[PDB]
Amino acid sequence: MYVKLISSDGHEFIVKREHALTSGTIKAMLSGPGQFAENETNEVNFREIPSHVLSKVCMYFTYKVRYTNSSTEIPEFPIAPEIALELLMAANFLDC
């Protein structure tokens, strides 16, 4: 049902598992290895991503799930300039 993503500074983000799978990297992390991925112990620790970046990543997951395959007018995804670089690196790393 839900997965917990840990940022580098210790923040915990609990997001719907299906949303977190938007990330190919996260899909791959829990693909593994691949046994007992059902021991009820599902969490990921990102020791390279700060909470101000993981929070946006999660907002992107929610945005992504909501507007794909929706015929509603799709809005622009906002990225503040001072996080653009960190988000680009996180997006690259997480493959999403």
């Binding site: 990297t25 791959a28 290895p33 020791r47 390279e48 960190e86 690196m89």
Partner: protein
Amino acid sequence: MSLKPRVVDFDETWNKLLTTIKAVVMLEYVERATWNDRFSDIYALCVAYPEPLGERLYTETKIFLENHVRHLHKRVLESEEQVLVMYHRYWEEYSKGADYMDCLYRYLNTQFIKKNPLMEIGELALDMWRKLMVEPLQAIL
């Protein structure tokens, strides 16, 4: 640490990665925490300066598969009154293994073999086994 390109010591890392890799090919246990960290290692390796250790990680992985598929060739070489069935068990094994590696090496796959005859980690595994099969395809007289 950080996502930016870091100064990173190769062999310190390719060792721990190696332990995990050989674990993964033979389907032995990998604790998920270290699995996560192995992802973070193949990243740091791929982005590191002065020169990116992408290619070096590729070739170390390739030698690893050569030794392992040739070793499978020698372990199934011991008849045990059981070629094929041994061959089969080992191929089931080695295949799910190659899948899990293809997972683990994802970043090397997506971002490095865009450069290019190089092939994806999984596919590579398969070619190595196609020399384990090309060898008994010949020994079929």
